[PDB]
Design a protein around this ligand. Sequence first.
Ligand SMILES: COC1=C2C[C@@H](C)C[C@H](OC)[C@H](O)[C@H](C)/C=C(\C)[C@@H](OC(N)=O)[C@@H](OC)/C=C/C=C(/C)C(=O)NC(=C(C)C1=O)C2=O
Ligand SMILES: COC1=C2C[C@@H](C)C[C@H](OC)[C@H](O)[C@H](C)/C=C(\C)[C@@H](OC(N)=O)[C@@H](OC)/C=C/C=C(/C)C(=O)NC(=C(C)C1=O)C2=O
Lengths: 213, 213
Amino acid sequence: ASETFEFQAEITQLMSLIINTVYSNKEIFLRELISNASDALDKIRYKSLSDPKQLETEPDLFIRITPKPEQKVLEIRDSGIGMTKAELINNLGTIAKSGTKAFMEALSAGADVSMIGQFGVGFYSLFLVADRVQVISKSNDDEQYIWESNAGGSFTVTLDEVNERIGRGTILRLFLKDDQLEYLEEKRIKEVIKRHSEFVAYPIQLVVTKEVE
Amino acid sequence: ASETFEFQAEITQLMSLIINTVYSNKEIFLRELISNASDALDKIRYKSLSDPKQLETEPDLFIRITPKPEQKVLEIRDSGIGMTKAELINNLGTIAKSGTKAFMEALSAGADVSMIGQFGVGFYSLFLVADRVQVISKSNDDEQYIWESNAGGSFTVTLDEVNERIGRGTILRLFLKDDQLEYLEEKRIKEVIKRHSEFVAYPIQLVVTKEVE
Ligand SMILES: COC1=C2C[C@@H](C)C[C@H](OC)[C@H](O)[C@H](C)/C=C(\C)[C@@H](OC(N)=O)[C@@H](OC)/C=C/C=C(/C)C(=O)NC(=C(C)C1=O)C2=O
Ligand SMILES: COC1=C2C[C@@H](C)C[C@H](OC)[C@H](O)[C@H](C)/C=C(\C)[C@@H](OC(N)=O)[C@@H](OC)/C=C/C=C(/C)C(=O)NC(=C(C)C1=O)C2=O
């Protein structure tokens, strides 16, 4: 089933920094994850200009937020390009990232966490509000895989026999911290999107569950 | 992966009858599926009176409707007792049912389809509005399985490596007919529940997806 990999050292260090910070504007994590989703929709949409059959696995291009209050979990879905087993491994931890040290140096010098995205390491901002992540992803070029981290020194990557089938793309499964359940609520989610994600080319769907009156 | 089984002969016959009928009150299929859900919630709730650890796999007791417009699919979820591989096989087709012939005889004599549930064969009413069903189920006593039918002479039962994990219970996955997509819409669903499912002990949740304004 399930392989384990080592985080490059500064990535550990940065995650540890973020997860431990008192910062007062953690809502930016959603700006980042939405903007990553958009970057991945862009990428597949562009790819299919020269290869239209790439869109076939999943014709609709969207971003979808799903609060799961009962599980203390928030999910950000996209029908973007997705990632293969080897891209999860390389790009999410094992290799040194061009901005990690520079950002941490900026941070300790006074910089706002908000700036994370400009150092190209804004995926790690999710730890502002979550102590476990699953990245579940299906690329047109591979089977569906689950990448998991708890901010420790290592992560796991497992063949997905367990979750619904993504036609194509990626789900970010955030297990929220108990002092961050504000991000489970419709009003809150809507506000953060309004404020920080006005200029997004793709529909952003919110999946909401109400008991029938 | 995937075994195939034979429908007992009258069950085929009845399915063929239902799927082919012009009947003007097909909405009753939802009454039936909700009431089955309730029968399965009852059953686990009762079981755990003498065995409280049975509720642990899924503490919440609910029924959940999820329209999937993009897929022409409606899902009815319950956290009831669920079914094992052997119960799917026995109880959903292979063995002769006590009411099948009697109901078909009632039908051709004038009876309203609405009466199906009183012959204890109301599960088959789903074919009024669907030409494919998946029954995905997880019983505390077995792995999660998928039972599939297209109203033909046979059905399949496959180990589930493909759908999200039910802690416990059952999802009815209806693939609706093109002239029955009315059941994908919030207003419609709500109306049918109001009319036919007033007296239900369990919360009925409706999962709705709206694009953010
Ligand atoms: C230029 O692409 C980006 C990179 C470089 C690569 C990891 C890009 C990645 O390699 C397989 C892919 O092209 C996809 C599109 C990655 C994402 C943008 C994100 O995945 C999502 N959300 O589906 C996203 O993963 C959930 C990417 C995470 C990568 C990191 C660490 C991130 O913070 N910054 C990057 C962003 C925001 C990028 O847009 C980045 O490295
Ligand atoms: C008395 O239980 C019932 C039976 C007899 C058995 C199949 C019961 C079944 O055996 C494994 C289970 O006790 C569960 C609780 C079955 C359901 C009620 C239904 O499953 C759902 N919705 O989770 C439901 O399956 C999705 C049961 C389908 C069974 C048939 C054919 C049905 O139309 N009628 C029955 C109903 C409505 C029952 O309530 C029935 O046979």
